[PDB]
């Protein structure tokens, strides 16, 4: 049975801890994949952490990170939410140096991108077998969300980028059913830049908060309808939620245009709350350290800088990184609405630390009806490791 | 289908060995969590050992126990009864430095407490997702049973303490259905102290035997009804079952009041037998070594010191620790009554031994209709470990 | 649904390799229990290897075999046929230094014996929980088969010995349903000795071939009916199948009496074939090395020494050990009859080899309708191991 | 329910990456079998990688490859497609130094060959138990496909060779149902040689592309009907697809006869496409390095050398090896036709590299309706390993 997922995103006053995998502490002696870009998506039965592996294990010579990013060994694999990315509980998903995955209520669909940069291929798995393919349409690093894709009433949606990472590129919305592409759309967005979207369903449409790696310190936003007609632009709020970014005082919002005039970015997320928004970000304006989440009144729809709530989850003494959005299927939460959840990736090692390797653990949070006290569920690993000698 | 659990606790003349995990012997070379406070609860299909992890493994540098107690890395996880707490068979449960868990017949409900001491949060998982929340109501280490909670006819009950650990604090009884709090109650108990309850169902009500960490060497007892009206007091028997405690000869029982005038405590348990009680305790009056279980005639209801039976399970040359209560669901035992079982935690390392680490293995016992000979199913590990060099 | 198991044992001309676990080769680097006395029994879905563990792993200091035989850490655990006895695929069964296990068609029943020698207890698990108990009735090492027990039409049978191991002792047949003892019987056998029976169903009765550790180099045999009325005696064949034993030429058979006048023994097995028998034995008359299986015409019923077939499975340059019987449930083989199978334990280390440890791997064979060539599927491990330095 | 598998093989313009196990990179620190000849076959639910183990692990002294090829320790085991051949996720299949396996829609059937070279036995497992047997009929290394066997409408087919490996031998086609041989056929092929077939269903018949290890650099081909009447010969195409082989320019095809006049070979595969063929091969004419797949128009039926497509999957700087064919069951792909897939084995170590050991990882590809860019999903392991010191 197909998951409806037409309900509205729940309105929430705070986020409770869902899980924490401690992969890297565990990785010190146990057998754990050196991973990167983990993310969470849910079936109507269990939620899973998906990730990308080098094929190498923590504390092993193959974790030498001279092994490139988009390498032929890179794969998408998965475990259950909370478990470390260990070999012995890992499920194979796809060959991928970039991925999205989501469940429609019947089976898991995953999309893994691999191949050469100039001519990459994106393979669609449905129920654990390839069912379809997308080739690079612009010849420049075909790539996708690295967070959950979105399924409504049996059709699954996601967003991909083919083009340069630091200037204008091209963007597309795909629609598959049972792992067959059944629709696509080009996205007009001259001046604007879209990378690594974080998406979720909301009122029978797909809402995304993405990454502008060209010029904007605000996050681009798009809203997709089942007919693949779309609206696109930026998160209106007069507060920047990208890294690097400038200061809140020296920032003017926009619903239409990049602002901030800064190059680089990071994957991040946001949830519509009526006309409010929960926007997450790192605490540092420049580095991937700390993580917090602000609620701005009328933020989804105006250049508001009115903060109604602020909750810290990783303190600014500790390393953060990527973060993304997903919902709890109604079939799991029991609510009549879609419970908004997010995960925060905590990167340890290169570039900031003196190890030959890089990986990340994770923490997962879900919307609750109460305020949650600030804390820091940070990574915990004690660097460097034996391998680093 | 909801588990009835309205039947009476079975009357039993002794306890048979259920399981023994040997986690720490196994941990010498294999990949085993450094754990603390394991406990057992049963679904209508299988019984599980739940525990709290540091995220670290035995014989690994991260088992350095300078890592605090209520740490952000602490999690509740679980395996099947008898299996060691190994990474590769472990199931993630919750973020927690204090936990309760129980099954209602349809799904597992778990409750994990985490956050800062002054403002802690307790997340309720149902079927593996957070479904609800309790915030600290007294701002002083919100915390709970560390043993099985109790489910009757679809609603699950448990007991939490917010307050100081060495004087008067506050105590509450919670009632959830499908992971939603649907009732709560404050517990009047001036002079009395309640920590870390061990509970089980009995005649359609919840009976607990808990820990007084303030002044009493007897165990506080409470009996909860589905309407959250309760009775509270102490185990009547004129014999003290806490550690530290005094001697049996120099002790006068009470059904209402702490006695013994000693500060510290330990988690322990007891089963009503009509008006008799099976009370467990450590063999040493002062240290967590050895473990035995006495049956006192009319002990639940009078200041009796009449010992009908005594059974040793861990000898006084070996380390014990915490212990708690659970029942076999009728659906597993086949009996028309609720078979009483308990687990005994065996702590190795700090404080009593020269290691940088602390963990525990476990042994599980269940009520039988016969007398069982005394023996010592003690831990077995040969300390210290490689890491300790 | 209960397994019928009333059909006759199949008549077979040879045995095909079922499985080989290679536990000890694997154990060299992987995480494998140091085990002893593995055996096989089948559900109507899969067959499993059960074993006894020290709780220790190969190549670990806890495999130091100064750790006694009937120790408090000893447990019965299980994996699927063919898999090594590894921690991460192991299922907990029972606390035991002696065990039997069998499946009735609905659930697994296991029986584990533990406790002190003078007053041992045997716990019956049904569907993974204790359901009943047998205490030592003669106060002298209560103990059992170490091979599959036998289930016919919903009731399961097995055989236990309480007494001395080198003279006259006592013997009993137990009958349980859904893990409740529902019948028992004492076995008159003055002069005769019964240890460690190997049993299987055959024409709606239970047939066993056991170990005489008192005086007989032939194997005692018993045949049990559902009403627990029995017949008992020895395997008639004029050929000795125990170790140590004498030579075939200097041996006179008996259907009633021990013969051979030699003390020690070993667990072994035999299958009735109409009036013929497949008897297994080690190749050496004195040591547990090599393993072969002879078919003697009219061997079950006369002092025949007529060998119709001989098949070698472990060559006499390699270590053998215990061996036992089990059948394939009709629901798995598809035959209209009960396919006879056996397993051979291959012991490595103490006493014959210079290691601080002892364990065993295994090979499993099943009756086929053809002759199978002789070969040697021996253990394979290269001794000693790192730990032995 | 039986899998139909009567549909035609899909016509495909290219192959997408299915999986990549990275076993050997992973094997550097984790617990991974030293394997050889992995292959893939699919149930109507999941696809699996089957392999042969020494019983030894990577980086362990038992991976010393002086341990012979057809050894008594050799076993067939299996994991899910994409997962490494790790101990802890491995399922036992059979005792085998040569194997085939396939699923009929109800259960897995496997065939493992073991025993002595002069008198080998092939055991048939159905649903995880032996159900039947084939003894060596020519007394010279009875052996089989090392790739998926083929099931149509409930009966499973495969091909075996008994004889010498470098001259004329004997060849047979077997037909089992539910693990019982129900038909067999001798194959007249004087002058021609058949080893290690790669097979798949196609239009309700079984098509194989095999290995001529006697004289032919082209691949022998056979087509089997459910009545075990067959046609046999060679892949017509005027292009050689074996290793070693000569050059394309100096080669004349044949539909009937070996050509190339070279001794040795390698396992490889081919798919009929109407009258076209997708033939795979190594890139080197002499060594097992690189892997590519050519589509030759009218190749199945004429001496065509017309290349319509060429796709590289392992570049000629990297080690390849064996390769074989399998299909996706309709129940998984959703197509109305049989999706052709293949796997390529990548051998590391002896003979070409300075290690004491030999194993292989793998990559899996499936027919898609598009052209896929060339890339190299090569092994990745960094040789030699710790053990090699
Ligand atoms: C290529 C466009 C950008 C996305 C804004 O590159 C990402 C920049 C980035 C970051 O830290 O912001 C990380 C992404 N990435 C992917 C990978 C490998 O595919 C898996 C570790 N490595 N780094 C990069 N993605 C890819 C497909 O290489
Ligand atoms: C805080 C009140 C008391 C309970 C009587 O503290 C326990 C005292 C205790 C004991 O040995 O009696 C142990 C409990 N504990 C929990 C923890 C961590 O949360 C998991 C290892 N460490 N110690 C302690 N509980 C918490 C929430 O820290
Ligand atoms: C006690 C009677 C005999 C059985 C003929 O002892 C067995 C003698 C024996 C042998 O090698 O023939 C082995 C059995 N055994 C059991 C055990 C432990 O319980 C598990 C390793 N060790 N050895 C022994 N059984 C027990 C309950 O200790
Ligand atoms: C015996 C006929 C040939 C097949 C063309 O031998 C294969 C030659 C070969 C190759 O590299 O082409 C490898 C096959 N093989 C099997 C094995 C062991 O059975 C498992 C590693 N080793 N090598 C060999 N097969 C067997 C049954 O030994
Ligand atoms: Ca940016
Ligand atoms: Ca106290
Ligand atoms: Ca004897
Ligand atoms: Ca050739």
UniProtKB/TrEMBL annotation, chains A, B, C, D:
Q: How is it modified after translation?
A: N-glycosylated.
Q: Which stretches of sequence are listed as region Head of neuraminidase?
A: 9-389
EC primary class:
hydrolase
Q: Where in the cell is it found?
A: Host membrane; Virion membrane; Host apical cell membrane
Q: Which GO terms describe its biological process?
A: carbohydrate metabolic process; viral budding from plasma membrane
- Which cofactor is essential here? Ca(2+)
Q: How does it sit in the membrane?
A: Single-pass type II membrane protein
Enzyme Commission code(s) on record = 3.2.1.18
A Gene Ontology molecular function term for this protein is:
exo-alpha-sialidase activity
| Covalent S-S links between cysteines | 10-337, 42-47, 102-149, 151-156, 197-210, 199-208, 236-255, 341-366
Q: Where does Ca(2+) bind?
A: 212, 216, 242, 264
State the activity regulation.
Inhibited by the neuraminidase inhibitors zanamivir (Relenza) and oseltamivir (Tamiflu). These drugs interfere with the release of progeny virus from infected cells and are effective against all influenza strains. Resistance to neuraminidase inhibitors is quite rare.
Catalytic machinery residues: 69, 322
List keywords of the entry alphabetically: Calcium, Disulfide bond, Glycoprotein, Glycosidase, Host cell membrane, Host membrane, Hydrolase, Membrane, Metal-binding, Signal-anchor, Transmembrane, Transmembrane helix, Virion
Q: Which domain of life is it from?
A: Viruses
Query: What's said on domains?
Result: Intact N-terminus is essential for virion morphogenesis. Possess two apical sorting signals, one in the ectodomain, which is likely to be a glycan, and the other in the transmembrane domain. The transmembrane domain also plays a role in lipid raft association.
Q: What does this protein do?
A: Catalyzes the removal of terminal sialic acid residues from viral and cellular glycoconjugates. Cleaves off the terminal sialic acids on the glycosylated HA during virus budding to facilitate virus release. Additionally helps virus spread through the circulation by further removing sialic acids from the cell surface. These cleavages prevent self-aggregation and ensure the efficient spread of the progeny virus from cell to cell. Otherwise, infection would be limited to one round of replication.
Q: How does it assemble?
A: Homotetramer.
**What family is this protein classified in?**
Belongs to the glycosyl hydrolase 34 family.
The name this protein goes by in its record: Neuraminidase
Give the source species: Influenza A virus (strain A/Duck/Ukraine/1/1963 H3N8)
